[PDB]
Amino acid sequence: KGEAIRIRSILRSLIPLGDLVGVISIAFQMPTIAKDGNVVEPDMSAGF
């Protein structure tokens, strides 16, 4: 169907593949434990 192909072409023009690849390549920050047994928790309500 030509309309579906047109929509997919429009979406591909809007969003390049490289941008998606880069955003997928971006990683998070792992929570870690201190001396004390208390794991420090990066705020999930914030951050990536």
């Binding site: 998070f28 792992m30 929570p31 794991v39 928790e41 990066p42 999930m44």
Partner: protein, 48 residues
């Protein structure tokens, strides 16, 4: 027990693994890419 770990497990098991399962036939020839595929298998097994 960290919430981010649960979110990451959710993300992986909802998006990454289904995609790699649907793209399974494309995994036919990977001879000169052995190091990455061995790593993938071992990481999947550890996650399991």
């Amino acid at each position: 027990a960290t919430d981010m770990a649960l979110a990451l497990n959710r993300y992986l098991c909802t998006a990454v693994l289904p995609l790699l399962t649907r793209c399974a036939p494309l995994f036919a020839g990977t001879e000169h890419h052995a190091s990455l595929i061995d790593s993938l298998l071992h990481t999947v097994y550890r996650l399991s």
